Symmetry: C3
């Protein structure tokens, strides 16, 4: 079950958006924790979510909050369509925004952000603490490494792999594998 209330850590734009998704799930109230009220392990053990966009910082908090013993839940909007054979790591800090689609046998690891109207096609693997931005789309069988960032309206052709800690620019179209980390921009996306 879910608690009646939920802690949203982060009070900037991303947090307001997470507040909307949590309410859509039926949480009656969001208690924002400042990120800049303040956090300590003694708070009533409500469900928890880290509403910080930056992958590295979100991860360091996630590491903290877990060790302090809170359940970092997933915030999944009801309008997200998720194949029954897709796997989304449970109680793993994952945000899935409105009108996201995740298709057959895709895997979403912990800490991932799947932002508004993004698409994860069949058989993809989205590595932990990745951020698939607004409208970004992975064709089938794509491997997104840990801590990757796919910019707004970017896309990845099918059967491609993107190395851990890479950034795909807003609007960029990735058409080849990238085994070493980098920043890739344009159509086709090129190392920048």
């Amino acid at each position: 079950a879910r608690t009646e209330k939920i802690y949203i850590y982060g009070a900037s734009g991303h947090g307001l958006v997470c507040e909307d998704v949590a309410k859509n799930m039926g949480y009656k109230e969001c208690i924002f924790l400042d990120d800049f009220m303040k956090f300590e392990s003694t708070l009533p053990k409500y469900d928890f979510f880290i509403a910080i966009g930056n992958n590295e910082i979100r991860k360091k908090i996630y590491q903290k909050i877990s060790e302090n013993g809170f359940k970092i839940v997933n915030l999944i909007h009801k309008s997200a369509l998720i194949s029954p054979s897709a796997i989304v790591e449970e109680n793993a800090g994952i945000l899935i925004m409105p009108y996201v689609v995740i298709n057959a046998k895709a895997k979403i690891e912990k800490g991932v952000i799947l932002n508004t109207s993004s698409v994860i096609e069949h058989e993809c693997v989205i590595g932990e603490f990745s951020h698939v931005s607004v409208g970004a789309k992975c064709a089938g069988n794509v491997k997104i490494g840990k801590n990757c960032f796919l910019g707004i309206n970017s896309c990845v052709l099918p059967n491609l792999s993107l190395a851990d800690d890479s950034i795909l620019g807003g609007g960029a179209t990735l058409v080849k594998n990238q085994d070493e980390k980098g920043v890739f921009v344009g159509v086709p996306a090129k190392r920048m």
Copy 2:
């Protein structure tokens, strides 16, 4: 409340699409006014909508029809997802198409068109009589000026501002501020 019938002004493709949205809202019938039957202030005071894509012309009509005393309503498809803290100017000629998403504290001014599957992220401001085309996406905290046109599948990176009367080309990815008006195309979008 809404009247049982609604005037759709414009009989081209955009008008047929507005007819679909008005019916989705539950209007029982759309009475098309020619734009090329003809309009005069004496018609029964049904709800009204200007189904003209061009921002300048839509605005001049809007100016007319209001002064003649008709309520120019908003046509909002039921599948649009609109944050409770987003503000959409009421009875202000705004069209919101299927699967549009408008997130926390965004503001949509009068006369705007938000076309199919477009995305207005949190805290954006879309200036009056703008047209955000099919699939076009504004990241968070974007300011779109009055009478702007964002082309199909274009996008704007977060915290950017686009000057009044600018055009962002189809497919273009805007990555920097643009304080003076222009036509911007490509990935990254460049002054054309």
Copy 3:
């Protein structure tokens, strides 16, 4: 009506996705036929679908299966929004994925794939056995020829026509007519 069961021909990623759409429609069970169990005309006459992405091969099978007397149905996800005045050829092997939008008076011919979150605007014509990929968008009054392939996140400006057997690259933005076949890539899309 639809039969209780349906044959899905093709057992790769595309087939798993078609299995999801068929179930969403309420088929109780998908019987996969190997494409590599095996097919012959004597099987119980359940509804049939060709879950092969390649346009040429899908067509040759479609030609076969029809001549063997099976009804090749359409698989249309419930979350697809299809104008009442749009025409989708019935029992014509058409796949329409989640969150697809087809607007007023558009026409979808037999064998077309409209993949996840794609958009077919008003008055378009999508020619038979075309594949409009993930997130690809046709503005209003676009003519897509037979056996065309529009890549992930590509788009076509309004009132354009694309010649039979053309390919529009992933991410590409087509801004001019193309009366002779080709492969078009980039923003703007250029012959490659």
